[PDB]
Amino acid sequence: GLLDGKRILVSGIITDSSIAFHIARVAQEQGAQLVLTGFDRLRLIQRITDRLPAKAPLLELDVQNEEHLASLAGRVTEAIGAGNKLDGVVHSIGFMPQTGMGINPFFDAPYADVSKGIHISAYSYASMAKALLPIMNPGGSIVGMDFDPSRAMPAYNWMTVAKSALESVNRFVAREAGKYGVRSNLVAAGPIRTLAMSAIVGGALGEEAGAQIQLLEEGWDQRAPIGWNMKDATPVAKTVCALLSDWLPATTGDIIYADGGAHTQLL
Amino acid sequence: GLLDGKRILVSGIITDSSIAFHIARVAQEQGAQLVLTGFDRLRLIQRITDRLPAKAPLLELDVQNEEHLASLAGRVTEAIGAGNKLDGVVHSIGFMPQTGMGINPFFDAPYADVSKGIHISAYSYASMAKALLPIMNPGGSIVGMDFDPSRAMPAYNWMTVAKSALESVNRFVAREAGKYGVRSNLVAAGPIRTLAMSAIVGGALGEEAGAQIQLLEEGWDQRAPIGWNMKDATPVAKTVCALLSDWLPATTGDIIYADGGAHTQLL
Amino acid sequence: GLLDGKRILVSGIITDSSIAFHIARVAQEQGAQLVLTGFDRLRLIQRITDRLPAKAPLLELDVQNEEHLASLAGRVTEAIGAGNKLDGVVHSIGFMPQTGMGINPFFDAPYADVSKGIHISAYSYASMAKALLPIMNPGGSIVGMDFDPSRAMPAYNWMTVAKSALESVNRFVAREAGKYGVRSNLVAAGPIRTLAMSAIVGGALGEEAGAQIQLLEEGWDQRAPIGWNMKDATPVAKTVCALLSDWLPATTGDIIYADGGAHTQLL
Amino acid sequence: GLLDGKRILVSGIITDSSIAFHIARVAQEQGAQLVLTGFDRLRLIQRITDRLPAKAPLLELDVQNEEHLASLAGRVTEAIGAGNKLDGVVHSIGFMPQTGMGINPFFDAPYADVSKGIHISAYSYASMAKALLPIMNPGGSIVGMDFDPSRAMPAYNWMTVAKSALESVNRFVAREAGKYGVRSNLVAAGPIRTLAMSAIVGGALGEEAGAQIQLLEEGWDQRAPIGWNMKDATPVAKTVCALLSDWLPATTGDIIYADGGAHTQLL
C-alpha cells in the first residue's frame, strides 16, 4: 500500500459523510495504522468508525480545550506504544456558527461567533501541529482541509475568512514543521455533499443560501475539465493520502487542489 | 485638488509617523474635508493632528467597542452637518499583542491574544463599513491598509494571519459596499519606519526579530524596480488618495500594491 | 487636470470603439499633450482621431517592423520638439489570428499564427519600452492593456497565452524602466464591446464562440460588486490615466484590475 | 510499485543530469514501462539511457518538426504494441537561445530567438498533447516541467516569459485532455544543478548572470522550510511520478511545487 507501515492521526470524523471518514478508510486500504480523534459525541464517532476497514483507537479532542491539547501527545504515545512516533497528521476540522455562514448578512455576524469559527477552523491547525510535532518522525506529513477562499462567494461569508486565515497559518506551520523534517500542506477540495451540505441545499441556512450553493455545485462540475462529483469524497481522500506518502517530499507550506481543476478555469 | 469637495473619514492616527497621518495630510493638500477617528489617547491624537494642514474634527473610536460603532454614523453626521454624507473612508488600524509578533514562537501565541489582533486588524474593517456605508455617497470609496501576507516571513507571525483574514474580509465588504455604489480596496504598502518599526529594529520584540526586519527592509529596496524608501510614507499616502478619488472607478474588492513593485520581483 | 503638462504617447487607435480612443480622449480632457501611433490604416486613424478633443500628431508604427521601432524615438522627438521628453506611454496593442481564437480548436492553431500573435500582443510591449525609455522623463509611466489570463476560458485560447506572456514581459520591463525612474504596469480590463467583440458575439469566429463570449459578459456583470458595463470604456480609460499620473508612484511591474471587481468574486 | 502496469512516454533526456533522466529512473523503479523520446543527438541519448534500470525504446522527436509530431502516435503504438495505449506523458523540454537568457540585456533578444524558445518551451506542450491524447487511456496523466515565473528575476529573462506562457498552455491542454479522461499538470521545480546550470554558475552566460544564479540557489535553500538540495533531482522525479499515478485524480490544469516550499516563504 501507498502508506504501508505509516502511523497516522486522523481528526474530524463525525458521520459517515465526513471527508475524514473517507481519508481514514483510504489510508487503511493503503496500509496505514491509524489513531483517531473525535469531538464531543464520542459514542457516535466510535459507532461510525466501527465501519472503517480496520479497528483504530479513538481519542477525545476538543481543539478549544487546552487540557486536551496539552495531554494529546502522551495519549497518542499510549495508543501507538512507547518508542513509536506518528508519520502523519490529518486536520479535517472546521466550524462556523450560523450567524457567520448562510443568509445571515455578512455584517451581522457577532465577533464572539467569528472568533469561535476562526479558533476551530484556522488557529487549531497550529495547535495540532504544536501538540504533535514533538512525536512526529522525520519525513512526516501534516495535512489540513481547505476550501479555496481566494475570491469571495455567496453564503460562505466568515468561513471564507477562516479559510484565508488557515492558508496563512499553514505557511507558518511549515516553518516550524521543517525543523522536524516534517511537511505541512492543505488540500483545497471541491464541494462535497456531506450531511451539512445537503441540509444547506435543503434550506437549513435560508432559501437564498440553498439556491446559491446549488448554483456553485453546478458551476464547479461545469468548470472542472475532468468534472466534479460532489457525492464522491474518494478523489479528495486519495489526494490527502498522496500528501501523507513519500511521493510529494519537496512540497510544504502549500495547497494542493483536489477540485477537478475547477479553480484553473473561468468558464 | 485630486479630492476637492470630498468628505473623508480617516482612522488610525496615533503619532506623526502613523501612515494615517500622511494619508490625512496628502488628502487635505488635495482639497478633501476630513473627519478623524482616534483610539484611547485622544489628547495625544488632537495635539498630533494640530500639525495637519487644516483643522478636522476628531471623534473617539475603539473598534472593539460596540457602543462606539453603533453611535459612529450619528457622531460623523453631527460633525459634517445633517444632509451631508462621506465620499471616503480610510481604515488604517492594526494591532497584534507581542505574543503574536516578534521572537515569541509562533506556537506560543495564546488564542485570546491572536483573537484580539484579528478583531482589531481584520474584523474591524467590516465593522467600520457596516457603520459608515449608510452615510456614504454613491461613487464613494473605503480603503484599508495591508501588508502582503501571501507568503510567510520571520517575526510577522500572527499579524500575517490577520492580514490574510483582512484581504478575505475586503472581498466580502466589496459585495456589501457595491449595493451603495461604493468601492472597497486595500493598499498593500512596503515597510514604513514608524515609531513601532524603529523600536522593533532596535530589538523591542527580541534581537532575532530586529535583525530579520532589518534584512526584510534591505531586501525590499533591492527587489523594488523603482526602489523603496521606508522613511517616506508619501508614496503610500498618494496611492490611498488615488483609490479615494474618481480615477479608479472600476476597481473593488481588490489590492493595490504601493511597495515599489518589490512583490513582482523574486531577486 | 490629472495629467496637466504631461507628454503621452498613445498607440492602438483603429476605430472609435478602440479602448485607446477612450484613453486618448480622457487623457486630453485631463490636460495631457498627446502623440499618437497607428498601424497600417493611417488615413482611417487620422479621420477617427479628428474626433478627439484636441489635435495630436499621428506617427506610423507597425510593432513587427524593426525600422519603425528604430526610428520611433527620433520621430516622437521631432513631433514633441527637441529637448522635450515623454512622461507617459500607452501600449493598447493586441492581435491573434482567427486560428488562435474562437471555435477553431486550441490544438489547430499553427505556430506561425501563435508566434505572430505573441509578437504583437506581448513581445511588442518590451519593443516599445526599449524604443521610448531613452526619451522618457523620471517619474514617467508605461501602461499596457491586459485581459486576466490567470485561468483558461472558452474561445480566448492562444490570446490568453499571449496575455500570460505579456504579464511576464511587464515584470521585466519594470526592471529596465526603473533605471530611468519610470513605472511599468498593466490595466486588466473587463470585456469591452469593441467592433471586434460585437462581431465575435454575432458569430464572426463561429456560433459556439459567440454564445460563450455572451455568457462571459453576463457572468462578468453578475460577479462585479459594482457591476460591469461592457459598452462603457470610460472607467478603463480613467484607470489608465490614474497609472499615467503621479498618484500611483510606488506601483510597478504590476496589474491594476479595472473589471468592476469581477476577478475578486467566484459567484 | 507506484506506477506498476503503466505505459509512460518520457521526453527530455539529453545527459545523466537531465531532470527527465531522474523521472525515467524513478518511474522504472516504480514499475512503469517506458517509451523515450530524444532530440537530435540520438546516439548520445541511447548511450545515456543504457544506464536506466530497464531498457526502453527510444524514438526521435524534434518538437519543431511537424512530420515528427504527425508520425509520433503511430511510432509509439509500434513500440508499445497495437491495442496498447499510454497512461502517462512527461514533457521535460525547454530551450532559450543565449540572447534570451543570461547577461544579454532583456531588450536585446531578437524575436526570432524568443519565438524559437517559446515554440520549444511552451507551444510544444500543446503539440505533444495533440499528438498523444488519441493514444492515451482514461485516468491518464500529462506532466510538464515548470520554473515558477510569477515574479521577474535576474538572467532568466525570456525563459521566464516562456514559462508564464507554458502555465497558460497547461490550463488549455487540461480542457482538451479532460475529454479523454486525462489530467494535465506542471511540476514547478526548485533549481537543479544540471550540466547547463553548472556552466551558467561558471559564467557561460556572463559573470553577472553566474553570480545572480548562485545567489538564487542560496536564497532558495534558505527560504525552503524543508531545505533545498539543488544536486538532488530525486524529490522532483518523485513529484512527477505522484502526478503520473492514480493518487492525484482530481487535480488538473494545475501546478504542483516541488521546490522545498521556497515559493511559500518571503524570507
Ligand SMILES: NC(=O)c1ccc[n+]([C@@H]2O[C@H](COP(=O)([O-])OP(=O)(O)OC[C@H]3O[C@@H](n4cnc5c(N)ncnc54)[C@H](O)[C@@H]3O)[C@@H](O)[C@H]2O)c1
Ligand atoms: N464539505 C465540503 O464541501 C468541504 C470542502 C472543502 C473543505 N472542507 C473542509 O473539510 C473539513 C472537514 O469538514 P467536512 O465537510 O468533512 O464536515 P464534518 O462536519 O464531517 O467535519 C468537520 C469536523 O470538525 C469537527 N470539529 C468541530 N468543532 C471541533 C472542535 N472544537 N474540536 C475538534 N473537532 C471539532 C467536527 O466534530 C467534525 O468532525 C473542514 O475543514 C471543512 O471546512 C469541506
Ligand SMILES: NC(=O)c1ccc[n+]([C@@H]2O[C@H](COP(=O)([O-])OP(=O)(O)OC[C@H]3O[C@@H](n4cnc5c(N)ncnc54)[C@H](O)[C@@H]3O)[C@@H](O)[C@H]2O)c1
Ligand atoms: N508600518 C508598516 O510598515 C506597515 C506596512 C503595511 C501596512 N501597515 C498597516 O498600516 C496600518 C496603520 O499602521 P501604522 O504602521 O501607521 O501604525 P500606527 O501605530 O501608527 O497605526 C495603527 C493604528 O491602529 C489604531 N488602533 C489600535 N487598536 C485600535 C482599536 N481598538 N480601535 C481603533 N483603532 C485602534 C492605533 O491607535 C493606531 O492609530 C495598519 O493596518 C498596519 O498593519 C503598516
Ligand SMILES: NC(=O)c1ccc[n+]([C@@H]2O[C@H](COP(=O)([O-])OP(=O)(O)OC[C@H]3O[C@@H](n4cnc5c(N)ncnc54)[C@H](O)[C@@H]3O)[C@@H](O)[C@H]2O)c1
Ligand atoms: N476589448 C476587450 O474586451 C479587451 C479587454 C481587455 C483588454 N483588451 C486589450 O486592449 C488592447 C486594445 O484592444 P481593443 O479591444 O481596443 O481593440 P482594437 O482593435 O481597437 O485595438 C488593438 C490595436 O492593435 C493594433 N495593432 C495590431 N497589430 C499591430 C501591429 N503590428 N503594430 C501596431 N499596432 C498593431 C491595431 O491597429 C489596433 O489599433 C489590446 O491589448 C487588447 O488585448 C481588450
Ligand SMILES: NC(=O)c1ccc[n+]([C@@H]2O[C@H](COP(=O)([O-])OP(=O)(O)OC[C@H]3O[C@@H](n4cnc5c(N)ncnc54)[C@H](O)[C@@H]3O)[C@@H](O)[C@H]2O)c1
Ligand atoms: N534545471 C533547472 O533548474 C530547472 C528547474 C525547473 C524546471 N526546469 C525545466 O525542466 C525541463 C528539463 O530541463 P533540464 O533542466 O532537465 O535540462 P535538459 O537540458 O537536460 O533538458 C531539456 C531538454 O529539452 C530538449 N529539447 C530541446 N529542444 C528540443 C526540441 N526542439 N525538441 C525536443 N526536445 C528538445 C533537450 O534535448 C533536453 O533533453 C525544462 O522544461 C526546464 O525548463 C529546469
Ligand SMILES: Cc1cc(=O)c(C2CCN(c3ncccn3)CC2)c(C)[nH]1
Ligand atoms: C463547501 C464547504 C466548505 C466548508 O468548509 C464547509 C464547512 C463544514 C464544517 N463546518 C460546519 N459544520 C457544521 C456546522 C457548522 N460549521 C464549517 C463549514 C462546508 C459545509 N461546505
Ligand SMILES: Cc1cc(=O)c(C2CCN(c3ncccn3)CC2)c(C)[nH]1
Ligand atoms: C511591516 C509592518 C506591517 C504591520 O502591519 C505592522 C503593524 C503596525 C500596527 N500594529 C501594532 N502596533 C503597535 C503595537 C502592536 N501592534 C500591528 C503591526 C508593522 C509594525 N510593520
Ligand SMILES: Cc1cc(=O)c(C2CCN(c3ncccn3)CC2)c(C)[nH]1
Ligand atoms: C475580451 C477581449 C480581450 C482581448 O484581448 C481582445 C483582443 C482584441 C484585439 N485582437 C484582435 N483584434 C482584431 C483581430 C484579431 N485580434 C486580439 C483580441 C478581444 C477582442 N476581447
Ligand SMILES: Cc1cc(=O)c(C2CCN(c3ncccn3)CC2)c(C)[nH]1
Ligand atoms: C533554473 C532553471 C530553469 C530552466 O528552465 C532552465 C532551462 C534548461 C533548458 N534550457 C536550455 N538548455 C540549454 C540551452 C538553452 N536552454 C532552457 C533553460 C535552466 C537552465 N535553469
